[PDB]
Amino acid sequence: GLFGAIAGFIENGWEGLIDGWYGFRHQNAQGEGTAADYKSTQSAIDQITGKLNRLIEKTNQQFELIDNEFTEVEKQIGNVINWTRDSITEVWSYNAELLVAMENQHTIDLADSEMDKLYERVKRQLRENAEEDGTGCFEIFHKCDDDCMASIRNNTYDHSKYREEAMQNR
Amino acid sequence: GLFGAIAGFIENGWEGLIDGWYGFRHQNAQGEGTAADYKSTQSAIDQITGKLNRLIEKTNQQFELIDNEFTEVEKQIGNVINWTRDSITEVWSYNAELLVAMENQHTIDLADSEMDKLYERVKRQLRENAEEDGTGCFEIFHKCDDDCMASIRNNTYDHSKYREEAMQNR
Amino acid sequence: GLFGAIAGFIENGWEGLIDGWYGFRHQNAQGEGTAADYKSTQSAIDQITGKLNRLIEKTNQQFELIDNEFTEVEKQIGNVINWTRDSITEVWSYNAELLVAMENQHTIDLADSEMDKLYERVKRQLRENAEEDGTGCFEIFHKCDDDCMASIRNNTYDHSKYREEAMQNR
Amino acid sequence: DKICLGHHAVSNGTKVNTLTERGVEVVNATETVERTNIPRICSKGKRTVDLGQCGLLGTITGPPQCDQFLEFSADLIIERREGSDVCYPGKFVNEEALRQILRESGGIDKEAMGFTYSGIRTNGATSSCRRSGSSFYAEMKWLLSNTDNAAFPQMTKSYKNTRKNPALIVWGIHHSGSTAEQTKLYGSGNKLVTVGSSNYQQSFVPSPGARTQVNGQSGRIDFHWLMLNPNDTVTFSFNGAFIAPDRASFLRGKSMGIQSGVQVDADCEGDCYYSGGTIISNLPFQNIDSRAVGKCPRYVKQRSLLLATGMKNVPE
Amino acid sequence: DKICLGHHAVSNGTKVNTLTERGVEVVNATETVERTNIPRICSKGKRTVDLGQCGLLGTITGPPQCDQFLEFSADLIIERREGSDVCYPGKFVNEEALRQILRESGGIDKEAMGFTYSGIRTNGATSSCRRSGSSFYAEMKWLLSNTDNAAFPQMTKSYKNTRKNPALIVWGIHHSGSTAEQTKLYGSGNKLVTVGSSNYQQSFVPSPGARTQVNGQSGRIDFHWLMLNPNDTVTFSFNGAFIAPDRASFLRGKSMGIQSGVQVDADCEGDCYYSGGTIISNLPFQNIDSRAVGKCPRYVKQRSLLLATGMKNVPE
Amino acid sequence: DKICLGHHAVSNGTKVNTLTERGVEVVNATETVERTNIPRICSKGKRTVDLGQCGLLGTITGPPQCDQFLEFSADLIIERREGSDVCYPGKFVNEEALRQILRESGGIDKEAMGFTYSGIRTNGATSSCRRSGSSFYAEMKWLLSNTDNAAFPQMTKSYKNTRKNPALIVWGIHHSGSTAEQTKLYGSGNKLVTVGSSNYQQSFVPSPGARTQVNGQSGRIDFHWLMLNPNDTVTFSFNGAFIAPDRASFLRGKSMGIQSGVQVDADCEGDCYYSGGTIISNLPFQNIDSRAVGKCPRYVKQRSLLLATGMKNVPE
Numbered sequence A, B, C: 001g002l003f004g005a006i007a008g009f010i011e012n013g014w015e016g017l018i019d020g021w022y023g024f025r026h027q028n029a030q031g032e033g034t035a036a037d038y039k040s041t042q043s044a045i046d047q048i049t050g051k052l053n054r055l056i057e058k059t060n061q062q063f064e065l066i067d068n069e070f071t072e073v074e075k076q077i078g079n080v081i082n083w084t085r086d087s088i089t090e091v092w093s094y095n096a097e098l099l100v101a102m103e104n105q106h107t108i109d110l111a112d113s114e115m116d117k118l119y120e121r122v123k124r125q126l127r128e129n130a131e132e133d134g135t136g137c138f139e140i141f142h143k144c145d146d147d148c149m150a151s152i153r154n155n156t157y158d159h160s161k162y163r164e165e166a167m168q169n170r
Numbered sequence D, E, F: 001d002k003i004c005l006g007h008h009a010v011s012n013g014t015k016v017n018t019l020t021e022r023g024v025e026v027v028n029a030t031e032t033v034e035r036t037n038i039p040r041i042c043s044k045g046k047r048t049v050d051l052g053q054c055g056l057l058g059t060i061t062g063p064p065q066c067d068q069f070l071e072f073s074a075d076l077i078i079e080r081r082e083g084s085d086v087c088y089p090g091k092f093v094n095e096e097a098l099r100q101i102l103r104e105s106g107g108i109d110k111e112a113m114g115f116t117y118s119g120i121r122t123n124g125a126t127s128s129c130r131r132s133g134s135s136f137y138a139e140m141k142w143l144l145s146n147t148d149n150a151a152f153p154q155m156t157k158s159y160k161n162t163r164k165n166p167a168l169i170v171w172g173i174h175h176s177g178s179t180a181e182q183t184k185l186y187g188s189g190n191k192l193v194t195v196g197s198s199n200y201q202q203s204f205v206p207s208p209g210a211r212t213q214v215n216g217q218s219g220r221i222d223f224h225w226l227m228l229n230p231n232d233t234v235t236f237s238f239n240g241a242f243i244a245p246d247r248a249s250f251l252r253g254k255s256m257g258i259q260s261g262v263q264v265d266a267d268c269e270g271d272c273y274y275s276g277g278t279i280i281s282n283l284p285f286q287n288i289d290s291r292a293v294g295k296c297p298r299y300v301k302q303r304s305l306l307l308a309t310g311m312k313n314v315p316e
Ligand SMILES: CC(=O)N[C@H]1[C@H]([C@H](O)[C@H](O)CO)O[C@@](O)(C(=O)O)C[C@@H]1O
Pocket: D123, D124, D125, D126, D127, D128, D134, D142, D176, D177, D181, D217, D218, D219
């Protein structure tokens, strides 16, 4: 991936996460938790949805026969027709191959990006009360119970409240 | 966007900014300011310009008639011609649709990136004398007058000069 | 570039680096060093390799004659053939131009990304024992000999060992 | 002590291809190339005409099998392999051009041209075009001399298209199994048929001689056709070996023509047809028949092209 | 106390489409599909030939309307709907092929073939090709017998292309309104015209008979043509019903042919033409006429495709 | 005191083009459009047949130059400019259609049709088709009357394709330099050839007259052809001016036909051919000949399109 998250420092994903695409898994006083982030998940999903609808496509362009399967047309005209058809088949076989490859590359790099968008955003909330482990975790240098964890998940956590305590743990 | 800036944490843009594409808006001792960053603005503009010129395109390939609008050609040959033309119309209608969609996606993600390039660069100047608010602002932990602000804008600001003072405000 | 690294803050690259694509160049007690990072280099290389193989392509689609170079076919049919061929030439000349331009843009932005992936990863190792200079260097606030440098390069460096000493140099 | 974050995964994800890699496993993917088929002609909501043993061109001339199709009307026209354009052996000059015209005609409306004859025979028949024994093409007149070897008086007939649309005009030319039987009908001596108009300008001469016994005959009928404009006028200068057009044909509107050997079904709706049935899909591509007609997905060489709809799959 | 940074926006930005979304509003966009038109033939800087009432093929045979076009020279050739290739009713075999040749010929240079005649008539005319009353095609000879019913002596004429380029050769065949008037010119008995060369090898026979009175005539002239190579030689074996070529035609250089019904304009320059005028654009695509000729943007189905040239627009 | 990190560069990198810029210098790039050529026909591992002075169509009729090619077999068929389909001057009706058939025929197998004749001449020859002096087409019979001006008795011959594959049938029509020499062979009076079957239905008439002396002759032979189905039957009703088919032709399998003027080489292997040699490449595109045949890279207008394979090059 391009954003270095998925298949990057986050060494792998959680098969236990049947809840959504992205999510937080914490370990604190009460124990361990694992819930999904609807917000970032829906953004990725809405984007992949957008591709599907724009690609699933009806061309209101009607094409009729120029060949004949029951009574073969003149050989010369029959060959120009076949020659043309094959040439266009080449173009569409090419376009289709590229289109899908192009989109897939983008689909992946889009998801990788959506993760990195979440990580870099949490880091902005905590400011000074925590430090990066490396493999996608925030080591908190202050006591954070389950209701402290939920304050981050619904984007309400205040860094000022635990600033002095956490900064003290230098 | 992919870079998480435009329509990300920067909740919205400034309609007052008729000066350029990107810019700094500060609030300090003297009051409030708002000026545009020519450097990053021109980079984005030069890139969008590049697309326009490469896309506005003349094919020196001359095509002449094979049809006849005044005296219809033989029906069979007339149908193969129409059949071919329609097929090629399908290809170019497809190519055009994709090309524009592909470029637009890139145009947007390019601009979003150019913002993120600026933000992450200022953060590198200030090093330790400031902290990230979250929604794209640097809370300065030391006194910074208007001429202190201008030191950053023209990329000259020295972090050492106000290091001890700002670090002290932990 | 999109990631702001190559031709960004890293003002230029090292022509001395004939060792690999990316690498570390340090200056410490013993003096100066310069070695290449195989890991990140191979990732970029494996990706560019992937493009080459998928693009170098054989279409098992055989095309035969419909023209005649020794004895010109009827003018009308000869013109429809030429007309068709030229039209398809236009399509493939277009596709080829775009394909290469599209890939090249991606090739560049992929390499720029691979650099940024490395930088942001080292910064995660050092956590608190160093600070960003701006132009892609980590100023270490603790003594780091040659064997201390090698601890980072093979991804083994421990921040805890020199945490207290380096943090002290605030 | 800490808070971690990541993404989802699966023990078994699907392999796709990217710009840079083949067989990269992702979370969820989807098919992009249609291969699934419906072995019927999905004609729900369409005025359909299954020609069966009637050849498309036969609906204009009128051999026995096409008696129920002389004035048909359709949105969808199906030709069958067993269909025949002819009873008495013969062919159409520019047949495919005419077939292509009729396929998108939306059906046909016939109209009498109004030809009367001074002292010749008309009720010419054959054991090939049988109804109550020997008969002929419903829309055609077999012009003869009163009895054996009698002179064929150089006649001249004419029709004017009095309608806003072009008229399909069809005449025939008799080619006898020998110059002997040729005279038995029209007499000896060179016989000539000339046809003209604004657009059109040409003429025809018979060519008697022995051919293989097709359908129980050594003779052949050459059917020809032109497209007469509004107000324009057709003229038939002739003296034998001629098959007169009783009624002229007029196109109804719009339609589509296909060829198939599968059964018609009014339960399902379709727009993309081919000889083995109907392609119903929303997918942009298809790997079934390159010669499919209608509103179809683009035919491609690949049997499959998987589109990633999930993220990269990194397992545990 | 702090320093903030962001991007620009607008109260009213434009909607574009991306790979992943429709109608995403951006700052500044631009049109990519040309729809704007110029209702004239922009011919500034080009040697233009507006044929008007002269048919393109007529410049070779020479009916009255084409007398000022018998040796034209052009970069751009315009055909008009009112143009006519013919005075005495008749057609060109392989007309479109020949039209396509003449459209990119860059004009024509004529040259006499040099045919003299032993005891026949030549000044054949008609009330159709009128100048000072009855006349004929400027480049053609109406070969007859000395007076009514006289024998047409089996002649033989020949021409050799003594030039580096292929020569356009055109002869005619007379088809009389009856076998009666046919004899009045060439006498009775079968008449035959054969033409050959290196490349070419074929022959022709008349077909008299009554046709509709087009232009005041029931007869028709069949014009034919071949492309004679350098040093090669044409031979006309004939005995009547023949229209002799006085002068052979030679192509000048290069040009383009179009068809239109709009007025010529030397004020504006253009390279992409169609029947309703000229498409001037730098845009890669166009939604105006699919049959446009010249150096044109690619025709597409869409009336509009907007290209983003600004960033994402997030308003206040 | 610190640790720095960066990327590689070079004093001289290559310029490529991107979506957003032209001539951006990168580290390492590669060519994408083939221009390199091999001036030979790389036929390593293929059954090749270089026709030389034999015309492709000539392998069916059998003029002297094609005596060694009457039953050839190939994977690759090469036509040469000096090749000739004919000894006695004449042409093939629908020649290109037939050439295209033979090019992918994989060679031909001949079989006698078995025609015997009651009281006429057969050994018709000419000084053009020379072997031991005057001779004829190896696969054809020159049917005549016993001696000068003798009657040509209206005969009838027939052949049935007793094989699973369609048979290529070829007859000829003689066109004499005059009606005089025509009678010297078949006598005077109208002569007629009619040919029919299931599929086929048509007829032919000679056209004597003086043509240019090509190859030392003023007469021409018109070769015609049809494609006879299994079990179907050919019938030749004729009375002169006829060239009888001795042997019928059967297609072997599959092959490719090309046209070239370069020497054959069994050292190199190729799949993409054109008249100046062979294109060997893995590159997806080529700027050499637009009319190349076989398994070829896509022809494009550009002489060059460079693909970046290295990173952005920022020098010191
Ligand atoms: C109008 C007429 O004459 N019809 C007769 C024809 C034709 O004379 C020849 O078939 C022409 O080729 O021959 C028949 O044997 C036949 O085909 O049934 C009997 C039939 O009564």
